[PDB]
Design an enzyme around this catalytic site. Structure first.
Site, PDB file in Angstrom:
ATOM      1  N   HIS A   1     -29.530  41.370   2.084  1.00 31.44           N
ATOM      2  CA  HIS A   1     -28.670  41.188   3.251  1.00 31.44           C
ATOM      3  C   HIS A   1     -29.306  40.635   4.500  1.00 31.44           C
ATOM      4  CE1 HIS A   1     -24.955  43.137   1.876  1.00 31.44           C
ATOM      5  NE2 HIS A   1     -25.713  44.050   1.290  1.00 31.44           N
TER       6      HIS A   1
ATOM      7  N   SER B   1     -30.847  39.980  -4.492  1.00 27.77           N
ATOM      8  CA  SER B   1     -31.709  41.131  -4.768  1.00 27.77           C
ATOM      9  C   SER B   1     -31.703  41.492  -6.249  1.00 27.77           C
ATOM     10  CB  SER B   1     -31.272  42.343  -3.937  1.00 27.77           C
ATOM     11  OG  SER B   1     -30.001  42.809  -4.355  1.00 27.77           O
TER      12      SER B   1
ATOM     13  N   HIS C   1     -32.723  46.081  -1.738  1.00 30.75           N
ATOM     14  CA  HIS C   1     -31.456  45.326  -1.671  1.00 30.75           C
ATOM     15  C   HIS C   1     -31.082  44.991  -0.215  1.00 30.75           C
ATOM     16  CE1 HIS C   1     -27.272  44.164  -2.395  1.00 30.75           C
ATOM     17  NE2 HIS C   1     -26.899  45.050  -1.489  1.00 30.75           N
TER      18      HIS C   1
ATOM     19  N   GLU D   1     -21.641  39.793  -0.808  1.00 32.67           N
ATOM     20  CA  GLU D   1     -22.414  40.373  -1.901  1.00 32.67           C
ATOM     21  C   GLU D   1     -22.723  39.434  -3.053  1.00 32.67           C
ATOM     22  OE1 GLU D   1     -24.021  43.333  -2.716  1.00 32.67           O
ATOM     23  OE2 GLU D   1     -23.685  43.897  -0.693  1.00 32.67           O
TER      24      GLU D   1
HETATM   25  C1  LIG Z   1     -19.283  46.055  -0.973  1.00 31.53           C
HETATM   26  C2  LIG Z   1     -17.825  46.660  -0.850  1.00 31.53           C
HETATM   27  O1  LIG Z   1     -16.838  45.556  -1.143  1.00 31.53           O
HETATM   28  C3  LIG Z   1     -17.561  47.372   0.600  1.00 31.53           C
HETATM   29  O2  LIG Z   1     -17.507  46.455   1.684  1.00 31.53           O
HETATM   30  C4  LIG Z   1     -18.615  48.515   0.964  1.00 31.53           C
HETATM   31  N1  LIG Z   1     -19.994  48.299   1.054  1.00 31.53           N
HETATM   32  C5  LIG Z   1     -20.978  49.398   1.418  1.00 31.53           C
HETATM   33  C6  LIG Z   1     -20.457  50.780   1.693  1.00 31.53           C
HETATM   34  N2  LIG Z   1     -21.274  51.806   2.033  1.00 31.53           N
HETATM   35  C7  LIG Z   1     -22.585  51.594   2.120  1.00 31.53           C
HETATM   36  N3  LIG Z   1     -23.309  52.696   2.484  1.00 31.53           N
HETATM   37  N4  LIG Z   1     -23.219  50.422   1.897  1.00 31.53           N
HETATM   38  C8  LIG Z   1     -22.486  49.319   1.546  1.00 31.53           C
HETATM   39  O3  LIG Z   1     -23.215  48.176   1.342  1.00 31.53           O
HETATM   40  N5  LIG Z   1     -19.015  51.080   1.616  1.00 31.53           N
HETATM   41  C9  LIG Z   1     -18.051  49.948   1.247  1.00 31.53           C
HETATM   42 FE   LIG Z   2     -25.078  45.265  -0.277  1.00 29.34          FE
END
Ligand SMILES: C[C@H](O)[C@H](O)C1=Nc2c(nc(N)[nH]c2=O)NC1
Ligand SMILES: [Fe+3]
Length: 307
Positions: A173, A232, A168, A213
């Site tokens: 990303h 992904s 992913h 996302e």
């Molecule tokens: C995707 C959601 O809206 C938010 O921005 C977050 N994404 C992520 C997160 N933590 C990790 N480890 N990875 C992420 O992609 N904490 C919060």
């Molecule tokens: Fe992500």
């Protein structure tokens, strides 16, 4: 006002604040009954735990089984990119294959991918153990730092993961972070989050959900996927550009409060005009967030300037 890092090095304070009892511990997780998988995940978690800003990201020798899982994911998704993915994605993918080892038989090492991103837009990766709070995750974007997982989903279900995993991160990303406009857009979300009240952090996380996302974007007279969650997910990538979901223009006062679930295909997607436009909208939205100051990132010294 909530504390927030003012120097890129201060992001180190984060590893000491993740959910310590992660998804891999759940009874329904694909790898739950596999003790080798469990130790393997703790191994990657330990690498993230000992990582410090500035250090090269440790290389890891992936096992044959992990390489197979990645191969399956890579090959099935690759078949969709030239027709479903935005221009920016397809433009950079060949370079990733050529210079970062993006291929069915090889899992790219994060250090190489990070150096590549740094050369494109100054974005860098930092290995991360598990789930960071939205505040800490978004905050890192203000420094053009992306917290990235290094482990891979369990091999028993290559087309499924209940959490982000390396397939992913790298196929979803990383390619968009290679684009200057997207990099600037992502960063604006991060800047908006610095010192913001929890209630706005949740609004920014929702905006992040519907763009980074699960975002769709206009491309000439067409529409393409740019959200990492779509790029992904083999099933949702094809579904998102079909007649089934509902599409609406990105409008932050509406987007920020829209509800969603993380378990089925999205019933509604927001369409950005372009990354520069989404960036402008975030900037305007950020001005409405009650903060006793403004923030600016100085890439020359890698410090956030507060006014
Ligand atoms: C995707 C959601 O809206 C938010 O921005 C977050 N994404 C992520 C997160 N933590 C990790 N480890 N990875 C992420 O992609 N904490 C919060
Ligand atoms: Fe992500």
């Amino acid at each position: 006002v909530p504390w927030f890092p003012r120097t890129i090095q201060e992001l180190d304070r984060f590893a000491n604040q993740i959910l310590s009892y992660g998804a891999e511990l759940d009874a329904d997780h694909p790898g739950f009954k596999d003790p080798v998988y469990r130790a393997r995940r703790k191994q990657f978690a330990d690498i993230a735990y000992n990582y410090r800003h500035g250090q090269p990201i440790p290389r890891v020798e992936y096992m044959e089984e992990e390489k197979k899982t990645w191969g399956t994911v890579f090959k099935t998704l690759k078949s969709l990119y030239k027709t479903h993915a935005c221009y920016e994605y397809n433009h950079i993918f060949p370079l990733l294959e050529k210079y970062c080892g993006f291929h069915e038989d090889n899992i790219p090492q994060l250090e190489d991918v990070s150096q590549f991103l740094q050369t494109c837009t100054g974005f860098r990766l930092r290995p991360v153990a598990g789930l960071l709070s939205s505040r800490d995750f978004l905050g890192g974007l203000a420094f053009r730092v992306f917290h990235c997982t290094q482990y891979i989903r369990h091999g028993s279900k290559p087309m499924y993961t209940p959490e982000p995993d390396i397939c992913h991160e790298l196929l979803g990303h990383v390619p968009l972070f290679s684009d200057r406009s997207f990099a600037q857009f992502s960063q604006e979300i991060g800047l908006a989050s610095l010192g913001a009240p929890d209630e706005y952090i949740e609004k920014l996380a929702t905006i992040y959900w519907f763009t980074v996302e699960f975002g769709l974007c206009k491309q000439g007279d067409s529409i393409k996927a740019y959200g990492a969650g779509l790029l992904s997910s083999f099933g949702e990538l094809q579904y998102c550009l079909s007649e089934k979901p509902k599409l609406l223009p990105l409008e932050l006062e509406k987007t920020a409060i829209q509800n969603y679930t993380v378990t089925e295909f999205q019933p509604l997607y927001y369409v950005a005009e372009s990354f520069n436009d989404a960036k402008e909208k975030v900037r305007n939205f950020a001005a409405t967030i009650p903060r006793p100051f403004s923030v600016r990132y100085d890439p020359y010294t890698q410090r956030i300037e507060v006014l």
